[PDB]
Amino acid sequence: VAKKNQKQAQVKEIKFRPGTEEGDYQVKLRNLVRFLSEGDKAKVSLRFRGREMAHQELGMELLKRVEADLVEYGTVEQHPKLEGRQLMMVIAPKKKK
């Protein structure tokens, strides 16, 4: 049931950045969640700029904490992985197993 249903839906993505302020980190979290709440899929992507080293250890520890922040309103469908020079995570809507 896809690309041929009725209203149909589409997964959304939200980018994040290191050293993000609580304010920006909150609204962003809500957005990502809003996508899950409705019932749609959502994935996060961390982009580094300049010295990725610092963002590497910090960007990693982030997804981990962030993933949990969602574990309460979502679940992990695809463990994070390193791709090229960017990090990406996949969050699934809190529904079924």
Side-chain angles (χ1 to χ4, degrees):
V1 59
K3 279 147 189 168
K4 292 187 272 165
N5 195 216
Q6 292 158 132
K7 311 189 293 213
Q8 207 185 265
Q10 71 203 160
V11 50
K12 206 151 294 348
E13 323 196 77
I14 292 300
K15 325 216 286 208
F16 250 106
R17 336 196 208 169
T20 280
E21 207 169 285
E22 306 100 272
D24 294 305
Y25 168 61
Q26 185 53 231
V27 305
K28 279 177 172 266
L29 249 168
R30 284 286 96 204
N31 206 6
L32 274 166
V33 186
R34 275 281 313 176
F35 305 173
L36 302 173
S37 277
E38 198 208 78
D40 177 72
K41 308 155 189 58
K43 322 196 194 88
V44 159
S45 182
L46 259 171
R47 163 173 266 277
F48 312 139
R49 0 186 279 223
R51 215 78 51 137
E52 328 196 320
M53 282 54 181
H55 298 154
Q56 200 163 288
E57 296 174 306
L58 214 85
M60 260 271 292
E61 262 43 55
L62 190 58
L63 299 194
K64 258 75 160 52
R65 171 69 56 164
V66 166
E67 189 268 14
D69 308 343
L70 274 163
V71 159
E72 288 204 332
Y73 252 75
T75 149
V76 78
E77 171 172 84
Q78 227 162 30
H79 319 93
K81 188 142 184 279
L82 179 72
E83 158 43 44
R85 303 270 287 262
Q86 311 279 115
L87 215 61
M88 189 220 314
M89 164 162 64
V90 187
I91 301 278
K94 184 161 142 271
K95 151 171 59 144
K96 220 191 86 57
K97 301 284 235 297

